[PDB]
Amino acid sequence: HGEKSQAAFMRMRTIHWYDLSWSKEKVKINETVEIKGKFHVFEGWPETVDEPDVAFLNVGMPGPVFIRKESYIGGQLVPRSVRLEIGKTYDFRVVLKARRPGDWHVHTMMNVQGGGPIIGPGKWITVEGSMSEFRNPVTTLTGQTVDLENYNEGNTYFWHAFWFAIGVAWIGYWSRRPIFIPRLLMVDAGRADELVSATDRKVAMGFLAATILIVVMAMSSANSKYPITIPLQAGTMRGMKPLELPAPTVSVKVEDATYRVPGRAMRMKLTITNHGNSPIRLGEFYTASVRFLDSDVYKDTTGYPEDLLAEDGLSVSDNSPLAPGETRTVDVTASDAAWEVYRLSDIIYDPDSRFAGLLFFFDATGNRQVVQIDAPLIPSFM
Amino acid sequence: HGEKSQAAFMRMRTIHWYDLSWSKEKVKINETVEIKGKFHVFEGWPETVDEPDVAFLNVGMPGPVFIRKESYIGGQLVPRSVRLEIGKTYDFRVVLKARRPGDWHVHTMMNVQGGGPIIGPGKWITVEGSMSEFRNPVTTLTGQTVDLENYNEGNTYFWHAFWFAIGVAWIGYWSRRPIFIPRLLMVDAGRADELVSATDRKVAMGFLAATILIVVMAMSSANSKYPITIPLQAGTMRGMKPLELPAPTVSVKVEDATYRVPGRAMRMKLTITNHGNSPIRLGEFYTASVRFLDSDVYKDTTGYPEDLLAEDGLSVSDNSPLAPGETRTVDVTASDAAWEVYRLSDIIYDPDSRFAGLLFFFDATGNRQVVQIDAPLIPSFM
Amino acid sequence: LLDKKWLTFALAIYTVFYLWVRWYEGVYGWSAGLDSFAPEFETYWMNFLYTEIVLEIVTASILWGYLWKTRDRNLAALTPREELRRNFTHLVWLVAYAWAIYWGASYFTEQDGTWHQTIVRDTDFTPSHIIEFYLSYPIYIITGFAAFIYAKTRLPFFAKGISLPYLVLVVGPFMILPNVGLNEWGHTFWFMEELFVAPLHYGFVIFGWLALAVMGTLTQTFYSFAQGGLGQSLCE
Ligand SMILES: CCCCCCCCCCCC(=O)OC[C@H](COP(=O)(O)OCC[N+](C)(C)C)OC(=O)CCCCCCCCCCC
Ligand SMILES: CCCCCCCCCCCC(=O)OC[C@H](COP(=O)(O)OCC[N+](C)(C)C)OC(=O)CCCCCCCCCCC
Ligand SMILES: CCCCCCCCCCCC(=O)OC[C@H](COP(=O)(O)OCC[N+](C)(C)C)OC(=O)CCCCCCCCCCC
Ligand SMILES: CCCCCCCCCC(=O)OC[C@H](COP(=O)(O)OCC[N+](C)(C)C)OC(=O)CCCCCCCCC
Ligand SMILES: CCCCCCCCCC(=O)OC[C@H](COP(=O)(O)OCC[N+](C)(C)C)OC(=O)CCCCCCCCC
Ligand SMILES: CCCCCC(=O)OC[C@H](COP(=O)(O)OCC[N+](C)(C)C)OC(=O)CCCCC
Ligand SMILES: CCCCCC(=O)OC[C@H](COP(=O)(O)OCC[N+](C)(C)C)OC(=O)CCCCC
Ligand SMILES: CCCCCCCCCC
Ligand SMILES: CCCCCCCCCC
Ligand SMILES: CCCCCCCCCC
Ligand SMILES: [Cu+2]
Ligand SMILES: [Cu+2]
Numbered sequence A, B: 001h002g003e004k005s006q007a008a009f010m011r012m013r014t015i016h017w018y019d020l021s022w023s024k025e026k027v028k029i030n031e032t033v034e035i036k037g038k039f040h041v042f043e044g045w046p047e048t049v050d051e052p053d054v055a056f057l058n059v060g061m062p063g064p065v066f067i068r069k070e071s072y073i074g075g076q077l078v079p080r081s082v083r084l085e086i087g088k089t090y091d092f093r094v095v096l097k098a099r100r101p102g103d104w105h106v107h108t109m110m111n112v113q114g115g116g117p118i119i120g121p122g123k124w125i126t127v128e129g130s131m132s133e134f135r136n137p138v139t140t141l142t143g144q145t146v147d148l149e150n151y152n153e154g155n156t157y158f159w160h161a162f163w164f165a166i167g168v169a170w171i172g173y174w175s176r177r178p179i180f181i182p183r184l185l186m187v188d189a190g191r192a193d194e195l196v197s198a199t200d201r202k203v204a205m206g207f208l209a210a211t212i213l214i215v216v217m218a219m220s221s222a223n224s225k226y227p228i229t230i231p232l233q234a235g236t237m238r239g240m241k242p243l244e245l246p247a248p249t250v251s252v253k254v255e256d257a258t259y260r261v262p263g264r265a266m267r268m269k270l271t272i273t274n275h276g277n278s279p280i281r282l283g284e285f286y287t288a289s290v291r292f293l294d295s296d297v298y299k300d301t302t303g304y305p306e307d308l309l310a311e312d313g314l315s316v317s318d319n320s321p322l323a324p325g326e327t328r329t330v331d332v333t334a335s336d337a338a339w340e341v342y343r344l345s346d347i348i349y350d351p352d353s354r355f356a357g358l359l360f361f362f363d364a365t366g367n368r369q370v371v372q373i374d375a376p377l378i379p380s381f382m
Numbered sequence C: 001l002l003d004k005k006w007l008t009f010a011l012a013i014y015t016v017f018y019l020w021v022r023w024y025e026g027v028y029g030w031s032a033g034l035d036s037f038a039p040e041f042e043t044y045w046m047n048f049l050y051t052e053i054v055l056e057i058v059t060a061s062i063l064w065g066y067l068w069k070t071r072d073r074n075l076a077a078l079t080p081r082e083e084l085r086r087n088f089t090h091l092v093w094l095v096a097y098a099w100a101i102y103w104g105a106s107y108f109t110e111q112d113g114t115w116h117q118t119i120v121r122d123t124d125f126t127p128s129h130i131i132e133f134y135l136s137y138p139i140y141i142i143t144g145f146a147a148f149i150y151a152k153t154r155l156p157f158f159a160k161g162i163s164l165p166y167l168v169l170v171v172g173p174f175m176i177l178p179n180v181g182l183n184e185w186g187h188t189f190w191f192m193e194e195l196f197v198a199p200l201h202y203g204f205v206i207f208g209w210l211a212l213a214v215m216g217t218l219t220q221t222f223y224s225f226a227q228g229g230l231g232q233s234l235c236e
């Protein structure tokens, strides 16, 4: 819900999310929904964004309407920040547990230490039930099971109220007598030395000694109880395992790319060379969370968000099968209302008019090839 | 002597020293002792430590009880800081010349520009003789041989004493007359204009002119003598040649790792897959300068420090030979007094409870394989 | 008569209006207020911004102009009892200023430590910003200016000169509003981290410090209270 405002070229060339899947579209309270997919770190990472040396796999959502039970990059849990390598493809998996009823737009996002949020596609997930039914149990290494919704809440309230009461008692003790104007007049007109006299000093000594003694006793008691404590666990985690993708058998060279101002379409001319031994066909163009599909070649079945999915938004001038070894140049047009709804047309406002995306090529048997394209995007006005 | 205080996880995952050797254990004055070995830069380098882009091969010792005659990374001398690559293994060689009699704990260490000292294993080396017998000769490109112990000492003493004498002469010249209270009274009560009169101004002019002239003449004389001088040679040295190790034929997956609090043992469950064509056996586990050995498989003969060596500290549930292609899961326990002496048990205080180490696998013929393992280390209390 | 029930209204108007504002932002925070380019955002928060800016400008102009036009020309012939009554009215103005300062600089400011820390910003006009900077700040600025003008135009102590502590207390917290430019500039450009303690916040802080001039302002009001009707009793 935080994208459509970021720069179009920065959304195009940071991170490409694909193979996204959602386990469920509608859940009950305490029910789990799992989000899977892959993201590729673009080679032409913008210089204004710091390299993803420190990155965190986050969830885009309006507060804890879900709780993040687990999150994985590769196959290993990532509760801390992680290091990503430019040009590598990683697979991710986020497990969410429903907490608050309603209709929520859930995004998978990557926060980069020096570049800000990179928001992936968002999907509407319905939560039904009552928040009062939500439980977040956890078992500690000390052998006790607690609910994270209310654990330590009573202790926190008690201690804060106790110390607030001590301070209020001090202030009220001094506030029983007249406060401002008579005391000001006494201090000004001659030496005061009358508004602070025993047993006021004795009361202050008692307050100070009691404060120190209570702090020490409370610390000792909180050490006898909970004798086993550990510090906060933090630190960027290295050695994220990237996907070992096979080398693509399709090479694509972008010969100019244009978009009409104003308009809802993007046009580019590609020289596609088919290696390997199977006839390929262009099935998809993904630019920034928007999938332009050639419906005659490929159809989406993973429940991709409709406002981000162009079922027939990809038109190829000659999308006949490309025989192996054969090279041809075609005009590819990606047109959909999403191009203007998600403000991908506002790249005219950007200080770097370059686009990046993913082309998905499919053969007859159905196996697909992913190739990455990037080129300057030239607006056309007449 | 500076380790056992650093964080256990940081000592575990920075740099792993192995194949360490010492040419001699007891030396005479002016005798040379050589320290050799390999160090591997851990892939999971902690984010709190700057990457070893600028690193210096140092020696941990109580002052110049030895002088560093030579130091090598790869096969080339490294008198300056060097650049190391994460994940690479380098071989090193430090040549030390004994200078001060006594029993010294000599460590090989790596200082990293933004992370501080990484201290390797330390070995007690005895030095016998007299410091007065120590010589540090060196031959310059100008064809003169000097002893670095006392070269230029007389000149330094002479010039410092000369300038100190000049300053003391100035102060005493002004201090022959009364100093503080009469001069203060003269300055306060009326205009002073009497305590600084000729020939005081003439003496000050003489002092200033003599100072400038002596500085110029001394610089010219020190340029006529020593006509050939070079600036200090500094600058990080790139292109350190790492060892080209063969790819290991053993793959190990750590399925949980635990240590008792309190305790002197660490337990982990490993899934070991034997590739290649020889039966392997687990012989060693090195975690942080501590070598846990399975005495039935391997014995140390390189004179490793005893307090860092656990001869039978490594117990494997099933350490029978592992046939090629066979995969088995075993429980590995590393137990020794060193685990508590070097405070490796204090990882419970650390904000990142993850360990790293090296497993050494040996076959029947004796050739060994080095595999690296890293996993979270979970304390157990009950 | 002396202190009258204008103090009750001074507390109640801010309390009720800001409770309604909190209800409004609780209802339209999500669901017309998350997406800054949705049409419903324009009808529920951009319209709110426009209406509140126009109403704040009109109210400030009317209130300040009325206070300045009804200024007491013959301050010399003011009885001590009337001066005491005017001092109490000025104290009511200061109470309203303190209440508005609380609502602006604590509640709705930290309410952001709750809005952004949870959502990914979509604009310089977050519904909460449409509440904090374009309401929790102009409202307290208007109240502070009105209190200063009332002191200057009804209290002989605060007449015949501009009180430095009052001017600081009135203008420094006002400088937080133009400081929003530094907030925006140093959110989009400098610092994409939602760090609340980022140097892009030493702008409300520095000028938040100037509210400490309330101490000098209040000792000045104490002296103004204790001019003719200082007692006796006090120091007697
Ligand atoms: C120092 C001088 C301050 C000046 C600024 C004051 C800002 C006032 C609010 C701006 C509203 C806006 O701009 O929006 C206009 C809103 C948009 O809601 P709607 O879509 O019509 O839904 C129906 C309306 N509900 C959602 C509120 C039910 O509707 C309105 O007409 C209602 C605005 C009522 C404001 C007056 C009540 C305040 C609480 C009572 C104690 C004073
Ligand atoms: C007479 C005295 C007045 C001087 C004040 C003028 C404003 C200075 C403008 C800086 C522009 C510049 O110099 O350079 C601009 C540099 C270039 O960095 P980058 O490579 O784009 O980094 C990329 C990192 N991003 C993507 C986050 C930008 O961005 C900066 O680091 C901004 C540093 C903050 C300086 C402003 C501090 C204001 C203090 C406010 C406290 C009250
Ligand atoms: C006599 C007093 C001297 C004051 C000392 C000032 C130097 C401190 C700045 C260090 C910069 C830094 O390192 O930043 C620390 C983290 C940034 O986190 P990061 O993005 O991970 O940084 C990674 C890149 N660094 C670490 C190399 C920069 O938070 C900060 O931005 C600093 C917050 C400062 C809060 C304390 C100031 C209180 C304000 C009081 C006035 C209103
Ligand atoms: C919707 C906006 C309504 C604002 C109403 C403003 C009322 C008019 C201001 C005013 O002049 O005084 C009102 C009261 C009572 O003081 P008055 O005596 O009426 O003021 C003049 C003094 N004089 C009679 C001796 C000449 O003085 C007060 O203490 C009134 C405090 C009101 C709180 C401030 C509200 C500002 C919200 C932006
Ligand atoms: C925006 C940031 C403010 C900058 C701070 C500058 C003001 C600080 C000093 C100050 O307030 O004094 C101005 C007067 C006080 O009386 P004086 O300054 O003595 O002069 C009175 C004659 N004058 C009204 C034309 C100024 O006070 C008034 O007369 C104000 C009431 C009249 C203005 C009403 C019209 C404004 C409608 C928007
Ligand atoms: C001194 C500052 C008081 C701030 C209290 C506040 O923000 O109240 C809103 C909150 C809203 O929670 P709730 O009471 O459950 O009503 C929800 C209504 N909305 C969602 C519109 C806020 O609770 C109340 O309205 C209690 C009334 C307190 C009167 C001083
Ligand atoms: C009164 C203390 C002020 C200390 C300033 C500070 O903490 O700045 C941190 C920042 C270091 O940037 P960093 O924290 O790494 O920011 C990470 C996020 N990006 C890269 C988007 C800015 O340094 C600067 O850019 C210069 C600040 C000038 C202050 C007058
Ligand atoms: C001057 C007060 C110092 C208090 C020290 C208390 C130490 C208690 C150790 C648990
Ligand atoms: C005012 C004194 C300047 C001295 C300059 C000496 C230059 C000597 C060149 C060797
Ligand atoms: C990246 C280093 C930033 C250093 C900022 C220093 C601020 C000091 C303020 C006086
Ligand atoms: Cu959304
Ligand atoms: Cu990509």
Ligand SMILES: [Cu+2]
Binding pocket: B001, B002, B105, B106, B107, B122
């Ligand atoms: Cu030592």
Ligand SMILES: [Cu+2]
Binding pocket: B015, B016, B040, B041, B042, B043, B372
């Ligand atoms: Cu290693």
